[PDB]
Structures are given as structure tokens and as C-alpha cells.
Amino acid sequence: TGVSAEAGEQIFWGDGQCSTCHKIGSSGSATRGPDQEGLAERAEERAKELGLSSGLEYLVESIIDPEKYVVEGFDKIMPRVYDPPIMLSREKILAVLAYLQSLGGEPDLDAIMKFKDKIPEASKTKVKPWVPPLAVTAEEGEQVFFDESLDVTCGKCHMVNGKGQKVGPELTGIGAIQTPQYFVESILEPSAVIVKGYETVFVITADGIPYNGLIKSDTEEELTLILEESGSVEEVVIPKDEIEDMKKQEVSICPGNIGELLSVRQFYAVIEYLRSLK
Ligand code: HEC
Ligand code: HEC
Ligand SMILES: [Ca+2]
Ligand SMILES: [Ca+2]
Ligand SMILES: [Ca+2]
């Protein structure tokens, strides 16, 4: 499809997977990462603050080394899209950069092409294949994911293709986006990265009653929280007019002792299942 902002648009909303986390104003609905409307102008300001040569260089850096600068208000969730699973080609990354420049700026093809030697080549990825130390299958991991008899049941909070209960984010298609290393960290260090919007809020009512949990739904008159305890959940509906204070906390209700509740085999099988969610 070549290096053009028009090709980059197809990739951003296509196999670049960018629109699974980013929206552009009212285009798209994803909120995992920053809204990219006006990104071209924003990048110029980040480049000045960070000592880079241009906003375009900041955009390049944001793709090749997502962890190097973390936008305030977000965690380190953006994958290196040139690595598996996405394995976005160098030509596709250049096209995406042209599209990003068009978000409030003008694409500069000559300038973009000069960064080609800085974009890692997906075919030459340094990532070693993911091979669990036991034989496990994705089908085995699906059984674990939904097993209600275990001390932890992912399906109590996560939905996949219409199955499971919606508390945390739906995981449909996540294996097309994230690495097994991210899945390991999500399960064993759940509060290390918190999907945007799934923070725990600490609420205090006028009567002095505390409620700590995830906001399920927030309307004009009622706030519904999901409380978590020992992998079990419960909903409470709090009248808004009874809320005295509320404070967001950078902690997750994705359970913190999964490493103690799953066997080695269950753990690696669940990871295989997630990888298979394409
Ligand atoms: C969710 C798993 C993401 C995917 C898929 C993509 N991006 Fe992302 N991006 C994400 C987050 C949480 C953040 C903020 C934290 C950080 O790493 O800085 C970002 C940031 C960017 C930026 C910088 C934006 C800014 O305001 O400075 C850019 C330019 C960007 N991301 C680009 C981008 C592209 C082109 C993607 C598809 C190839 C893409 N991202 C996917 C989360 C996620
Ligand atoms: C309710 C008590 C949950 C249970 C049971 C499980 N998860 Fe969870 N998960 C939950 C929340 C509220 C969030 C968002 C905040 C955060 O910690 O990031 C998550 C997140 C994840 C993710 C990241 C999803 C993403 O889109 O990036 C993963 C991969 C994940 N959780 C995996 C997972 C597994 C394997 C579980 C069973 C062992 C599991 N979760 C249970 C809430 C809850
Ligand atoms: Ca970044
Ligand atoms: Ca997490
Ligand atoms: Ca209770």
C-alpha cells in the first residue's frame, strides 16, 4: 500500500491495531491510550520538552520505544508493534507515521523516509519464540479460564466472544495485540499496569461508610461499584447524593494472588489461551 498518509490511515484502523487503544476525537471508541486528535501539534511540544529534533522524531520514538516516555495518566501498555504478535512491517510503520503527521500537521514523506533505518525490521525480530516449559494447549487454558471450581476464575470478570462476566476489560482479540510477557505480568503483577478506566475508586458516604472498588456505571443519580474480595465480587449501588468523597487509586481488582492459586500448568495453559485470542 506504500508510504502515504492514506495508507497509514488504513493501517491505524486496520492491522496496525492502533485503534484498539487509540481514538481520534469522535472517531473510534477506544480509551486504553491517549486520544490522538491534534497529535501532530502535541508531538512538537513533547519534542521540545524532551530535547528531540522534531515532533516527527517523537512520533518515531513513541512507536519504536513505547516505554521510553510514558504520557502522563497512562501506564506501560503499548506494545512494540514491530515485534510479535503484530509484526508490523517497516513500510507499514512509515505509512502510519505519515498518517499521524496528518493529525493536525502536514505529512513530510521525505522526512519520514529518512527514519527508515531507525525502525526495527519485524522479520528480524530479536524476540525468542514463546515456549512454555510444559506441554499445554489453548483449549486447556480455555477450560481453566472459565473453571468456576478453581480458587480464581478469569471468566468471572473477563468476557471472551460472549462468554464470561463483564467486570474487567473484554479480552476478545487480545492475543493479536499483546505479548505473552504482558500476559504474565498482567496475571502475576496485576496492579503494575492498569487498563485506563479500570482504576479502583475509594468512596466515602455521608454516613461515613467506605466502599472501594471499580466503577461499573456512573449516571446522574447512582454510582454502581464492583467490590472485590478473595477473587469474589459484589455490586453496590450508591446514591450519588450520599457520596462525600471519592479518590481514584492506581490499584486493580484483577486478583493479586493468582500466582498462589494456579498451578504451574494452569498458569501456562491460560497464557496459551490468551495468545490464541486473535
Ligand atoms: C494498547 C495496547 C495500544 C496500542 C495497540 C497502541 N497504542 Fe499507542 N499508546 C498507548 C498508550 C497507553 C500510550 C500512552 C503511554 C505511552 O507509551 O506514552 C500510547 C502512546 C502513544 C503515542 C504518544 C501519544 C502522545 O500523546 O504523546 C503515540 C504517537 C502512539 N501511542 C502511537 C501508536 C500507534 C501508531 C499505534 C499503532 C501502530 C499504537 N500507538 C498502538 C496504547 C496503545
Ligand atoms: C475480577 C476480580 C477479575 C478477575 C477474576 C480477573 N481479572 Fe484480569 N482484570 C480485571 C480488571 C479490573 C482489569 C483492568 C485493570 C488492570 O489490572 O489492568 C484486568 C486486566 C487484565 C488484563 C489486561 C487486559 C488488557 O486489556 O490489557 C489481563 C491480560 C487479565 N486481566 C488477565 C486475567 C486472567 C488471566 C485472569 C484469570 C487468571 C483474570 N484476569 C481474572 C479484573 C479481573
Ligand atoms: Ca510512550
Ligand atoms: Ca493489570
Ligand atoms: Ca460484602
Numbering used by the authors: 39 to 316
List sentences quoted exactly from the publication behind this structure.
Here, we describe a diheme cytochrome c with high heme redox potentials of about +350 mV, despite having a large overall negative charge, which typically reduces redox potentials. High-resolution crystal structures, spectroelectrochemical measurements, and high-end computational methods show how this is achieved: each heme iron has a calcium cation positioned next to it at a distance of only 6.9 Å, raising their redox potentials by several hundred millivolts through electrostatic interaction. We suggest that this has evolved to provide the protein with a high redox potential despite its large negative surface charge, which it likely requires for interactions with redox partners.
To improve our confidence in the assignment of the various transitions, we mutated the distal methionine ligands in both the N- and C-terminal heme sites to histidine and cysteine. The M→C mutants did not show clearly defined transitions at low potentials and showed considerable hysteresis, which precluded meaningful fitting.
